[PDB]
Amino acid sequence: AEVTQLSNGIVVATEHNPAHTASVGVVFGSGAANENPYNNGVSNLWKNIFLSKENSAVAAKEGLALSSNISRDFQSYIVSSLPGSTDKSLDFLNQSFIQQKANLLSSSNFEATKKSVLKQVQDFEDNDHPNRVLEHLHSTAFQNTPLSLPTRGTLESLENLVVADLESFANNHFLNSNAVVVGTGNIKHEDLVNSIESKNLSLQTGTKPVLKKKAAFLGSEVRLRDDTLPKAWISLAVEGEPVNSPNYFVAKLAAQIFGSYNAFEPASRLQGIKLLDNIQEYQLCDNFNHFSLSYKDSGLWGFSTATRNVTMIDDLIHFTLKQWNRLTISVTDTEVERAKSLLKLQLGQLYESGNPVNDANLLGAEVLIKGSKLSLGEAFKKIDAITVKDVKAWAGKRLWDQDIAIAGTGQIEGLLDYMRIRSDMSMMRW
Amino acid sequence: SSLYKTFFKRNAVFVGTIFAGAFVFQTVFDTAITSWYENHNKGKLWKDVKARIAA
Amino acid sequence: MAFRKSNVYLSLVNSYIIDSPQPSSINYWWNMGSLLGLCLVIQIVTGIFMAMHYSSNIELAFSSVEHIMRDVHNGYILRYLHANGASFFFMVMFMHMAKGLYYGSYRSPRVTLWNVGVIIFTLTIATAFLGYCCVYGQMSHWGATVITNLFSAIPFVGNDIVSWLWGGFSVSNPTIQRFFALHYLVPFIIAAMVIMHLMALHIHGSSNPLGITGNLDRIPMHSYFIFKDLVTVFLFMLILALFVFYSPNTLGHPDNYIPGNPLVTPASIVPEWYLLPFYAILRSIPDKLLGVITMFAAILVLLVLPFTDRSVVRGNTFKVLSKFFFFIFVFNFVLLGQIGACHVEVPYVLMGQIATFIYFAYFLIIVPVISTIENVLFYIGRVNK
Amino acid sequence: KSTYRTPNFDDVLKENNDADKGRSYAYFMVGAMGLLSSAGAKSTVETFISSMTATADVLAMA
Amino acid sequence: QSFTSIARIGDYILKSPVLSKLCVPVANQFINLAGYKKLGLKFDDLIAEENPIMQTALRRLPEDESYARAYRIIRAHQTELTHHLLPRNEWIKAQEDVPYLLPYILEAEAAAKEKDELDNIEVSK
Ligand code: HEM
Numbered sequence A: 001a002e003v004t005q006l007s008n009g010i011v012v013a014t015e016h017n018p019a020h021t022a023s024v025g026v027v028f029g030s031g032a033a034n035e036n037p038y039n040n041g042v043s044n045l046w047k048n049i050f051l052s053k054e055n056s057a058v059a060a061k062e063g064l065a066l067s068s069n070i071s072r073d074f075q076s077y078i079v080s081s082l083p084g085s086t087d088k089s090l091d092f093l094n095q096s097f098i099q100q101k102a103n104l105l106s107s108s109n110f111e112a113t114k115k116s117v118l119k120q121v122q123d124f125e126d127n128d129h130p131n132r133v134l135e136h137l138h139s140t141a142f143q144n145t146p147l148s149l150p151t152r153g154t155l156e157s158l159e160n161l162v163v164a165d166l167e168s169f170a171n172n173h174f175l176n177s178n179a180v181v182v183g184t185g186n187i188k189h190e191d192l193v194n195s196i197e198s199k200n201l202s203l204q205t206g207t208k209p210v211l212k213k214k215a216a217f218l219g220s221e222v223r224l225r226d227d228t229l230p231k232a233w234i235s236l237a238v239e240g241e242p243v244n245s246p247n248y249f250v251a252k253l254a255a256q257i258f259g260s261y262n263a264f265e266p267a268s269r270l271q272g273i274k275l276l277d278n279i280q281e282y283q284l285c286d287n288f289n290h291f292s293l294s295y296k297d298s299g300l301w302g303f304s305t306a307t308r309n310v311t312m313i314d315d316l317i318h319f320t321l322k323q324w325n326r327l328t329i330s331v332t333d334t335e336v337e338r339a340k341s342l343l344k345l346q347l348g349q350l351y352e353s354g355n356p357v358n359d360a361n362l363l364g365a366e367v368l369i370k371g372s373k374l375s376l377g378e379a380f381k382k383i384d385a386i387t388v389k390d391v392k393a394w395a396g397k398r399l400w401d402q403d404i405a406i407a408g409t410g411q412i413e414g415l416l417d418y419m420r421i422r423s424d425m426s427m428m429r430w
Numbered sequence B: 001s002s003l004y005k006t007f008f009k010r011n012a013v014f015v016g017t018i019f020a021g022a023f024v025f026q027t028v029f030d031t032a033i034t035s036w037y038e039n040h041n042k043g044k045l046w047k048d049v050k051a052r053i054a055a
Numbered sequence C: 001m002a003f004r005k006s007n008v009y010l011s012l013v014n015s016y017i018i019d020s021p022q023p024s025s026i027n028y029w030w031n032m033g034s035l036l037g038l039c040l041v042i043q044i045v046t047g048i049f050m051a052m053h054y055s056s057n058i059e060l061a062f063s064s065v066e067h068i069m070r071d072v073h074n075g076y077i078l079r080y081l082h083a084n085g086a087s088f089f090f091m092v093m094f095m096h097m098a099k100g101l102y103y104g105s106y107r108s109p110r111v112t113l114w115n116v117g118v119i120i121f122t123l124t125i126a127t128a129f130l131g132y133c134c135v136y137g138q139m140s141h142w143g144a145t146v147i148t149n150l151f152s153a154i155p156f157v158g159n160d161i162v163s164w165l166w167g168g169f170s171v172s173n174p175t176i177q178r179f180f181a182l183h184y185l186v187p188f189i190i191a192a193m194v195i196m197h198l199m200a201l202h203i204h205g206s207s208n209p210l211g212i213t214g215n216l217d218r219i220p221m222h223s224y225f226i227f228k229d230l231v232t233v234f235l236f237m238l239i240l241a242l243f244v245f246y247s248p249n250t251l252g253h254p255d256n257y258i259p260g261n262p263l264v265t266p267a268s269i270v271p272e273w274y275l276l277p278f279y280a281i282l283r284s285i286p287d288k289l290l291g292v293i294t295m296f297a298a299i300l301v302l303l304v305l306p307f308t309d310r311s312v313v314r315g316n317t318f319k320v321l322s323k324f325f326f327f328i329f330v331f332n333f334v335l336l337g338q339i340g341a342c343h344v345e346v347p348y349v350l351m352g353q354i355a356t357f358i359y360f361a362y363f364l365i366i367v368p369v370i371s372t373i374e375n376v377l378f379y380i381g382r383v384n385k
Numbered sequence D: 001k002s003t004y005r006t007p008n009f010d011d012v013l014k015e016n017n018d019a020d021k022g023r024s025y026a027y028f029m030v031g032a033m034g035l036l037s038s039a040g041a042k043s044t045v046e047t048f049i050s051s052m053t054a055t056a057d058v059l060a061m062a
Numbered sequence E: 001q002s003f004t005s006i007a008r009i010g011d012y013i014l015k016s017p018v019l020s021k022l023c024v025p026v027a028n029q030f031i032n033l034a035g036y037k038k039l040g041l042k043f044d045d046l047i048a049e050e051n052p053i054m055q056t057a058l059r060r061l062p063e064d065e066s067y068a069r070a071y072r073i074i075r076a077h078q079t080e081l082t083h084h085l086l087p088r089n090e091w092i093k094a095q096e097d098v099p100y101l102l103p104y105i106l107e108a109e110a111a112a113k114e115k116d117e118l119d120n121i122e123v124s125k
């Protein structure tokens, strides 16, 4: 458990633990939330040439493995080494992001990569209905606002993208003040920071990105009815918490109370979740899962679900929203306590997997926003300190009689109108 | 309007307050109307005619 | 499919009356319900034809009924059918209720069925009282007086309710005219409650004399129980006919052939026979308020039986102690009625107070204790450890 | 067209500088309708109930 | 009244040889007067089934007992409607009048009671 971050000319962040391999990468503070409607998908395209057969063979000769991830707030390019080769990873990083960042964009490479992210993003829209729905949830929830842009980009902005768009983006966002270099694995801080302060040369230092306009939640829906699909997939959310919200953890705990479910897993049917008494009688769904998604400016708190019970979708939604009503008025001590324990377990399994590439992404994203990483033991202190009173005060502000955002696809004829769903965000009282 | 958010604060008005307000309304409204009505018809009422008779 | 199934109106008829799956073993005790529907029809039809000749003014009401008796062609038949039919309506209702009591018909999943039944019973009692007042004989006037006064026992606002019900200082013209209007209305509310009763019946079906599931052997309503119903319909009509033609006044009170007199209450005043057990219960409590509370409670306590019957089997067919105490209850109820018909005099006052206790103790004490004991007896008689 | 490209609602959307503007208006209207209804129902019930009280012609002072 | 509770009271009586010798003869005579054996029924056939415990229990009954219960119930209804009893050689004998459904019922009540306990557990720190 370590967090050593220090700024030379660039900002260097590491977290070392004797494991096996080491992962080095640069993580930029700009993602799909920084694109336009019209160059949407430029980051995903950058990712895909960085992993192209040409660049990927040059790394595999050296015994290096490549990894990249496009998100909303950020963007990361990562090389995993075998831990004494922690220097030959920094060679491949700079040989790409200074030298080859004019050789990767060759006409034959770009056209074969663009053709591959087109088959890629098309395949997504055709078949991945849960993530497709969740992506459209962000699209309508945050419409005409940076968080609405999908991470993979749209088929139409993608096929109209040229080399100059990659260039213009790279020249405005792959800057020094919008970068953090991250090392996870087992390698020391002073083992890496010296290999970085070895070579100087700043490259476009002093240049800031471009500013924008703030993200906002708009209560709304997008309904992607398709009667030929064998199920209905729906996601429903309120405006949640940004990272570095006081209620960052209260929100995450609230989502753990209702948790996630899988009708076919015997153990899942037995969880201490009151909602399960309602939904199992007539089998109202195959699965659901609650989430508290947090970004820089905003977040989404809600749930997603999939079902073949297409004539009782209204009972699914009704029982789920009646449970959420309880958070404001009647959530019990032992529900909160169950959530604490399970939130710790899952937050643990995230922050300490046996895979440094995940560690890098979690470290990178955190330090880009607040300039530091809160340690796992520090989180548990915050989690344990949450009372029933906290959850109630949170839910009464975020959940009770608040606008929602809805998205769905498949057989959603039985998903009732907006106002019916929205009325269930509260209860009648004297 | 922020006159609403002082009394009821982004929540709807509850039945108990509605019922209570209705009892108040009934009396106030009736007096306001009877007053206007009897005034508008000054001179014609039995009230006014009795003031000009004595036996 | 067959038209009786596909048509929107006929399918209702088919699912309730033709194809409705009945347990093969229900006995003639399950014929009472159809006899109650028949009774409801007899009362409504004969009442409407009489209404055509009836005047509700307090000066004219008694004479307008004498006019039905004397001048209206077959008028005495209509009046005697109505009056004797009301009595037969209660005889059959008591049997329908007693059947329910014996066979555990009030039990889950038929609690709603039972509760709606208790409402119908209250409404039927109120309807017959309203009709009885319309004759405006001596029993009419004092019945109206005594029963509207039940409400004067209500704390603070009781005498206000009574003067509002009367429409004045005492039982007068306003009173009898509004009681006729109400007597005409409530039969139709009873009809709507009967439909709600049959709706709750339909989702679980009838029970049967064994108290167990009927699902393994059903036979259709049509033919079997249509013609079985016909047997008791004719027997019912035969007996009603013997009263209407041969003994039309045996179930009534001679004082109601005397026009009502606001200044004189006959010494011979007695409630209608079907109200006597309840009357006795009220008379047994030497306090005004508690008298009327206890009497109403004697009806509401019927609602308690699904909870105080602790047994694990439905019905009394295989229960030796429950059968015995059931008949204690029935004959105790008859005694309550015989006490009601008697004078407030020495042996009778005490007997009525003890019978009243037995009435309530049955639901609240005997059934929970005995059904628990029978539960345990069934167990230790077969388990060998 | 791409389903991620949400159509224009600018003509309908209240340019949100006041968040609870429509909510406060809606809840005032819904509240006021509730008030005047309950008073109306009360008056209607009293009208009918009072028609059963002693009529003007039967209040004789003997 | 739950079968867990009937079993509690009944077993207490059955063990203590004061009560055991006093009551069981009374109970034996009650069962014969009940008369259900003359219709070809076992007591457990008589238990009201329209509730979740009894539906769970009947669901878990082995096939062969299930078909047998079905026959005994149908045969009882047919005899009832003819206003007869069975030939005496067809009556259920006391050796046959076993609590065959009781173990499934008790098992289901315990499972249900635990769920109710666990759904309502308090926590102390
Ligand atoms: C469940 C239905 C009804 C019951 C239990 C019932 C019962 C009674 C009773 C007990 C009487 C007094 C009988 C007597 O003369 O001693 C009566 C009178 C009367 N009923 Fe009904 N009634 C019912 C429905 C109706 C209906 C729908 C009408 C239609 C207007 C009606 C009209 C009358 C009239 C005109 C009288 C006065 C004539 C008479 O005394 O027989 N009744 N009713």
Ligand code: HEM
Pocket (backbone or CB within 6 Å): C029, C030, C031, C032, C033, C034, C036, C037, C040, C093, C096, C097, C100, C103, C104, C105, C106, C110, C113, C114, C116, C117, C118, C120, C121, C194, C197, C201, C205, C206, C207, C208
């Ligand atoms: C005008 C009155 C009523 C009508 C027309 C009516 C009609 C019926 C009918 C057609 C049935 C099915 C056949 C039968 O079991 O007889 C039924 C069943 C039943 N009724 Fe009524 N009923 C009336 C009043 C009541 C009352 C007063 C009660 C109880 C307070 C009641 C309790 C029940 C119960 C519990 C059953 C189910 C019996 C069983 O299947 O074991 N009913 N009724």
Ligand SMILES: COc1c(O)c(C)c(C/C=C(\C)CC/C=C(\C)CC/C=C(/C)CC/C=C(\C)CC/C=C(\C)CCC=C(C)C)c(O)c1OC
Pocket (backbone or CB within 6 Å): C016, C017, C020, C022, C030, C031, C033, C034, C037, C038, C040, C041, C044, C045, C048, C191, C194, C195, C198, C201, C202, C205, C206, C225, C229
């Ligand atoms: C599962 O269990 C059942 C079961 O469901 C049924 C249906 C039956 C059979 C019994 C019945 C179907 C009873 C049905 C009857 C009713 C619901 C009647 C409702 C009551 C009424 C009063 C009908 C409405 C009548 C009128 C408005 C009167 C019409 C008036 C007229 C024509 C006036 C004419 C005069 C002039 C001058 C124009 C069973 O026996 C049974 O168990 C064995």
Ligand SMILES: C/C=C(C)/C=C/C=C/C(OC)[C@@H](C)[C@H](OC)[C@@H](C)CCc1oc2c(O)c(OC)cc(OC)c2c(=O)c1C
Pocket (backbone or CB within 6 Å): C122, C123, C125, C126, C129, C139, C140, C142, C143, C146, C147, C148, C165, C182, C269, C270, C271, C272, C275, C278, C279, C282, C295, C296
């Ligand atoms: C608009 C409708 C109104 C106001 C009234 C309806 C509701 C009231 C009832 O139940 C619904 C009511 C009939 C009651 O039910 C508890 C019955 C059991 C009445 C029992 C009853 O009868 C009597 C009776 O008949 C008489 O005749 C000569 C005389 C009586 O004194 C001597 C009585 C009497 O002392 C009692 C208790």
